[PDB]
Amino acid sequence: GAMAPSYRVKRMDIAKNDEECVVNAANPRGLPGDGVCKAVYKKWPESFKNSATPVGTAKTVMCGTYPVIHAVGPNFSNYTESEGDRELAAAYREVAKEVTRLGVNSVAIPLLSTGVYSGGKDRLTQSLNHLFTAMDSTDADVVIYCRDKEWEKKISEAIQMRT
Ligand SMILES: [Cl-]
Ligand SMILES: [Cl-]
């Protein structure tokens, strides 16, 4: 576990993380895909061997000794708001189980279902709150990765409001 488990946020490419494992915003088929998933495929392509897994689940594949946790959020273009919300909460619960099983002291996480899978809605609060629900009981240092300055600002505010 980390000495004083914490949440942080960084505005940079998750493929350049400084943590002991990474969470991929995966597609269910294990394809190279787009956005975070494509960056993860270019950095850790060996981790896409038999990485296909259903919506709401997480599947870990090693790249060397570095764990890639493929977490499949719902595409809100396809799911109802209600069913999508359930599957998004479930994907993060499965990430917490994998982080625990691996024994890592830190994990790099993106906000699931906030990009290509957002159905064109702002889902920062919805996705972050489900990340907290799952990860609050874990002792790994969590570092959230984002792209946009206004996302960094709001994520940082949400973290600090609990401290
Ligand atoms: Cl970067
Ligand atoms: Cl997404």
Coil, strand, or helix at residue 113?
Answer: coil
What is the CA 110 to chain-centroid distance, rounded?
4
37 phi, psi to nearest 5 deg: -60, -40
The answer on whether 35 is annotated among ligand-binding residues is yes
Tokens at residue 110, please?
Answer: 């993106």
Q: What method was applied to determine this entry? A: X-ray
The answer on whether 1 is annotated among ligand-binding residues is no
Tokens at residue 89, please?
Answer: 């909460």
Residues 127 and 103: their CA atoms lie apart, in Å, by 24
User: What ligand has the least distance to the C-alpha of 36?
Assistant: 2
Taking a 5 Å cut-off on Cβ, the residues next to ion ligand 1 are 12-13
27 phi, psi to nearest 5 deg: -100, 160
